[PDB]
């Protein structure tokens, strides 16, 4: 099966530069035109650039012409996007996508890589428990969680019991605070009778800052 694996996204200064990579497998890379498409936080899809199978032909949206360069290395099955002169408005998840030469659609997409263009500093989160109590218990159901506070850039990932616990979990979209820092919470509802017998641990990872936390959430 086809895969497109992206990398290279992260936090960069306005005016700075980044190179995104896309490692393609499961199909004949050189036979296909490729495209980068991006999506700003809370917004729709915007085509960025496209390159022919061989690389001799390239196309760009006007909003990126003269700053970004799309290129490919067929011998490595890799697509690239060199991003120069970055602006706050280039902040987006960038997708790698395979192009159908007959019908004109993008028939397969990578999962994306986040590019954040800002002058704000990287900072790791603090992780605080949302402790179960009688004030978070309603008839044999208890809620408990983790508050993942004050971090930058996005993203953070949150699992529960190293991913063994998935039912009833709600990990919320991060919110940007007035401080310029994000915060998020992740909660789960469990049987109240399990509070004395089952350990609940939220596993937080903020790779931007090299911050990993496991937070055991204990009854209050």
């Amino acid at each position: 099966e086809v895969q497109l694996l992206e990398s290279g996204g992260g936090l960069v200064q306005p005016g700075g530069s980044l190179r995104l990579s896309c490692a393609a497998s499961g199909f004949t890379f050189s036979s296909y035109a490729m495209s980068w498409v991006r999506q700003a936080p809370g917004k729709g899809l915007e085509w960025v650039s496209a390159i022919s199978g061989s690389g001799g032909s390239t196309y760009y949206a006007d909003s990126v012409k003269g700053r970004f360069t799309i290129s490919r290395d067929n011998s490595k099955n890799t697509l690239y996007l060199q991003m120069n002169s970055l602006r706050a408005e280039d902040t987006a998840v960038y997708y790698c996508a395979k192009y159908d030469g007959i019908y004109g659609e993008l028939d397969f997409w990578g999962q994306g890589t986040l590019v954040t263009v800002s002058s704000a500093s990287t900072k790791g989160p603090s992780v605080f428990p949302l402790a179960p109590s009688s004030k978070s218990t309603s008839g044999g159901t208890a809620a408990l969680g983790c508050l993942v506070k004050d971090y930058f850039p996005e993203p953070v990932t949150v699992s529960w019991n190293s991913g063994a616990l998935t039912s009833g979990v709600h990990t919320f979209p991060a919110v940007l605070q007035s401080s310029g820092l994000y915060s998020l919470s992740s909660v789960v509802t469990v049987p109240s009778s399990s509070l004395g017998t089952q350990t609940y641990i939220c596993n937080v990872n903020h790779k931007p800052s090299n911050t990993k936390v496991d937070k055991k959430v204990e009854p209050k």
Binding site: G104, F128, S133, K149, T189
Partner: protein, 212 residues
């Protein structure tokens, strides 16, 4: 460039109803028009290509029709998992362009939120700050009001709230509000209350604790 206009912006339809989504191109794109589904936290996925052709493994309940400048995506029977943003896309001409998207929401029966409140941790307090969290769990519709009160004083400006995307299984929402105060403010007051208003509740629900 070719502009693709999507209507409506939002479709809220009951599970099992037929969903019809419209995409209008500014100029004839012939049949070179595709449809994508994007679920929360995921890349778009091709549903339809060449105006009416279904991609590999795409459910038969998805279909497209149209030529030139008028196009339709149809979901024969909406499933709860069908909560997504749907986008059209043309490549009759460079530059490749996309519609602005239709969000299809699943209209389920009313569900009251389950309300939960959380005190700040000792660890955070030692840092000089106090966050109190209120959770509204598994409700419909999305509209809900959370009021924070500290010793009867409505707190405004010092909370942030977040709402999950519609659940793909039960069609509900959840909401988390964080009230943040200094440790000094928190220690000066007694009663911490979250008051929730939602149409599934016969009257507002209050969860509170005393710091003591």
């Amino acid at each position: 460039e070719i502009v693709l206009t999507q209507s409506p912006a939002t479709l809220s339809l009951s599970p099992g109803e037929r969903a019809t989504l419209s995409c209008r191109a500014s100029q004839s794109v012939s049949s070179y028009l595709a449809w994508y589904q994007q679920k929360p936290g995921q890349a778009p996925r091709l549903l339809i290509y060449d105006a009416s052709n279904r991609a590999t493994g795409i459910p038969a309940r998805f279909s497209g029709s149209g030529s030139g400048t008028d196009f339709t995506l149809t979901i024969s029977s909406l499933e709860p998992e069908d909560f997504a943003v749907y986008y059209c896309q043309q490549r009759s001409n460079w530059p490749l362009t996309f519609g602005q998207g239709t969000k299809v929401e699943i209209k389920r029966t009313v569900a009251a939120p389950s309300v939960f409140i959380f005190p700040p941790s000792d660890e955070q307090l030692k840092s000089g700050t106090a966050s109190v969290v209120c959770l509204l769990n598994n409700f419909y519709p999305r509209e809900a009001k959370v009021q924070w009160k500290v010793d009867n004083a409505l707190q405004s400006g010092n909370s942030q709230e977040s709402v999950t995307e519609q659940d793909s299984k039960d069609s509900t929402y959840s909401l988390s509000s964080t009230l943040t105060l200094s440790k000094a403010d928190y220690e000066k007051h007694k009663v911490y209350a979250c008051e929730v208003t939602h149409q599934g509740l016969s009257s507002p629900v209050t969860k509170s604790f005393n710091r003591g």
